[PDB]
Amino acid sequence: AEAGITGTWYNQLGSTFIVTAGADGALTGTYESAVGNAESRYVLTGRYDSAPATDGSGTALGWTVAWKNNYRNAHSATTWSGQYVGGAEARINTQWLLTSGTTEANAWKSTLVGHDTFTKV
Amino acid sequence: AEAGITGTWYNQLGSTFIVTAGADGALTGTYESAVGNAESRYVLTGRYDSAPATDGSGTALGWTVAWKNNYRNAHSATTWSGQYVGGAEARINTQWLLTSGTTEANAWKSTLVGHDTFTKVKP
Amino acid sequence: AEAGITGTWYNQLGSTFIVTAGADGALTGTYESAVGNAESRYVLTGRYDSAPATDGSGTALGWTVAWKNNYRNAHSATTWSGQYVGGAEARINTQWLLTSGTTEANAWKSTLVGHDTFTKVKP
Amino acid sequence: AEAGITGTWYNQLGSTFIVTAGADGALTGTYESAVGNAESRYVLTGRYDSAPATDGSGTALGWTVAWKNNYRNAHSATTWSGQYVGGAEARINTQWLLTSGTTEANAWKSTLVGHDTFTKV
């Protein structure tokens, strides 16, 4: 729990997430995707439960990446919600929402949903 | 535009969202929920597209609130993903995910999904 | 109650849902979408809780529409999950998932999520 | 594509899905869960694209199970949306929504979301 969130994590697609978990609940770092109209690292900011469990529970957290950096602007943002589980093999299990900025007409189809599992391997 | 988003907003459940959009695409503020095992304000951080498109397209954004403050700890976090639409009645239309910390056993039922629409009142 | 649900319903996009709730918990009917690469009516099948609770609780249900008929084939399917609420203004509030068939490569972006509310007009 | 959907599939949790895919798009069978206020088989009905791909694509399908049978009535329903991929190892990849019948007050928290992968192993 706590500390263990800090580090470099990779998801199945090969995207890399580098985060720092602050003692009070903050999450900061950068994200490099393997898919999308992405190119390079993007800033990410989030929050986690800095006082999780004491039943054998994971630590809830979530973070956002707006897909705009100095090289690309996909006009979209992704949010990941999930929980961290530490152990010999620690992982972050998430479900995400990716919303693109659309005109009203296309608003009905602006959000994609998926899931990603991140490991430090 | 950072400004347009900056302000106080309320959603249909009666929750309060106080946000400041910064020049670099950052979002910070506090959230007061009308529902849940929540009590008082919680800190929120997010990001938005500071350079949207020059048409009548919304501005994509998202933010997170971990439901822990000095009064309560719900051991859960919510992320909202959606878009800001300006005009006379500016709105933020979102879809959210609420994940609770759980044992490996109940992980299958750790996440709730819903949608919220916010109406702006103040800057 | 099977009846309450049986009827013609429309959602905020202007789509039509014609459904019959059968005694065993089955749902069958046709759906006419106002959006997408859809054209005409499509067959729908679903299930609902034929024995809900005896309080002011909604009736959970869900249905699917594969977007293929004799005129079009969009290679995608949508499932709606939500609840039926009776009264004078009966509504079906739902959240939906629209999955498109894709190559392994773009599978990450195969599913869209949204919400729809239906208002009843006819039985 | 087509035919291959018919069979017994199992998901990570150990739930078993037995389906029959009809030549015209129908899906019928039963579902036995490993989790939830479940007990036994429940009927399921769905639809699939009976004319998928010809790029190497999966077959979109979806189905519903209302959690009521002769033994239990959880007053909930689950819908799975996803696509089928055949091959030496065929699988059905899904994201699901589980809605419980609530009073209005609790409507905001009536739906759970997750994902499941099914194999014939």
Best CA proximity match to C94, nearest among C42, C7, C17, C8: C17
* Structural domain span for residue C17: 1-123
What's the rounded Cα separation, in Å, for the pair D17 and D77?
A: 15
| Residue type, position B86, single letter | G
Residue B111 to residue D109, Cβ atoms within 8 A: no
Resolution of this structure in Å: 1.5
| Residue type, position D23, single letter | A
Method: X-ray
| Overall size of chain B counted in residues | 123
State the total domains in chain B: 1
Question: A52 CA to chain D: closest CA distance, Å?
Answer: 22
CATH of residue D6's domain is 2.40.128.30
Cα separations (Å) of C29 from C8, C11, D27?
10, 16, 15
What are the tokens at C74?
A: 């969009």
Instruction: Find chain C residues with C-beta within 8 A of B115's C-beta.
Output: 95, 115
What's the rounded Cα separation, in Å, for the pair A36 and A15?
A: 11
Chain C, nearest residue to B82 by Cα: C114
| Residue type, position A90, single letter | A
Question: Which residues of C does the annotation place in the binding site?
Answer: 31, 42, 80, 96, 108
CA angle B29/B30/B32 to nearest 5° reads 155
* Cβ proximity of C102 and C82 under 8 Å: no
Give D52-104 as a 3 state SS string: CCCCCCCEEEEEEEEEECCCCEEEEEEEEEEEEECCCCCEEEEEEEEEECCCH
* Cβ proximity of A38 and A77 under 8 Å: no
* Cβ proximity of B78 and B98 under 8 Å: yes
Which residue in the set B47, B58, B97 is minimally distant from A66, CB to CB? Answer: B47
Instruction: Find chain D residues with C-beta within 8 A of C48's C-beta.
Output: 66, 77
Q: Which residues face C28 on adjacent strands?
A: C20, C45
What's the rounded Cα separation, in Å, for the pair C27 and C23?
A: 9
Instruction: Find chain D residues with C-beta within 8 A of B100's C-beta.
Output: none
Residue B47 to residue A103, Cβ atoms within 8 A: no
Chain D, nearest residue to C108 by Cα: D93
Instruction: Find chain A residues with C-beta within 8 A of D111's C-beta.
Output: none
**Dihedrals φ, ψ of B103, to 5°?**
-80, 160
Question: B123 CA to chain A: closest CA distance, Å?
Answer: 22
Q: Which residues make Cβ contacts (< 8 Å) with residue A95, sequence separation at least 6?
A: A80, A81, A82, A113, A114, A115, B97, B99, B111, B113, D113, D114, D115
* Cβ proximity of C22 and C9 under 8 Å: no
Coil vs helix vs strand at B99: strand
Question: B51 CA to chain D: closest CA distance, Å?
Answer: 32
**Ramachandran quadrant class, D28 (left: phi over 0; alpha: psi -120 to 50; beta: rest):** beta
What's the rounded Cα separation, in Å, for the pair C83 and A10?
A: 38
Q: Which residues make Cβ contacts (< 8 Å) with residue A104, sequence separation at least 6?
A: B56, B85
Burial of residue A3 (CB within 10 Å: 0-12, 13-18, 19+) is exposed
Best CA proximity match to C64, nearest among D115, D24, D78: D78
Distance of CA D82 to the CA centre of its chain: 9
| Residue type, position C37, single letter | N
CA angle B52/A76/C117 to nearest 5° reads 105
Best CA proximity match to B70, nearest among B38, B108, B24: B38
* Cβ proximity of A25 and A48 under 8 Å: yes
Question: D28 CA to chain C: closest CA distance, Å?
Answer: 10
**Ramachandran quadrant class, D96 (left: phi over 0; alpha: psi -120 to 50; beta: rest):** beta
What's the rounded Cα separation, in Å, for the pair D67 and B70?
A: 40
What's the rounded Cα separation, in Å, for the pair B114 and B109?
A: 15
Chains touching C (at least 3 CB pairs under 8 A) are A, B, D
